[model samples]
Target: GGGCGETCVGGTCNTPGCTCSWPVCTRNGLPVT
Candidate 1:
């Protein structure tokens, strides 16, 4: 599952955003911090 309708892959959803295991964090079909 994801947060704020964003897909969280290899990571966890937090208040700030998706905490990705790696450097790249993808959300809503886009890459975030």
Candidate 2:
């Protein structure tokens, strides 16, 4: 399974960087927490 992190949809300007740990999430080219 590979999703490269959760999809960020229905988004607005204020709430950015919202996350979900499904497949993968990379921060600074590294895996996010």
Candidate 3:
């Protein structure tokens, strides 16, 4: 819940005007999807 759209971590973003350093991934061994 720390990335853009509150759901991503990569350079590509499904949400317009959104950019990230990495794609949405697992956090704390938790699933991002």
* Candidate number of the best TM-score: 3
For residues 1-33, write the lDDT of model 2, one tens digit per residue. 232344434332222343333233323333334
Model 1 segments more than 4 A misplaced: 1-3, 13-33
The CA lDDT at 24 in model 2 is 31
Runs off by more than 4 Å, candidate 2? 1-3, 12-28
lDDT of model 1 at residue 18?
50
The residue-by-residue lDDT of candidate 3 on 1-33, one tens digit each, is 433434465445565444443654224433333
Worst 10 residues of 1 by lDDT: 24-33
Could you list the CA RMSD of all candidates, in the order they appear? 8.8, 7.5, 8.3
Q: Of 1 and 3, which scores higher on TM-score? A: 3
Cα shift from native, residue 19, model 3 (Å):
0.5
Query: What's the lDDT of the predicted structure labeled candidate 3?
Result: 0.44
Compose the digit string of candidate 1's lDDT tens values, residues 1-33: 342444345466553455454444435444443
The lDDT, on a scale of 0 to 1, for candidate 2 is 0.34
* lDDT of candidates 1 onward, in order: 0.45, 0.34, 0.44
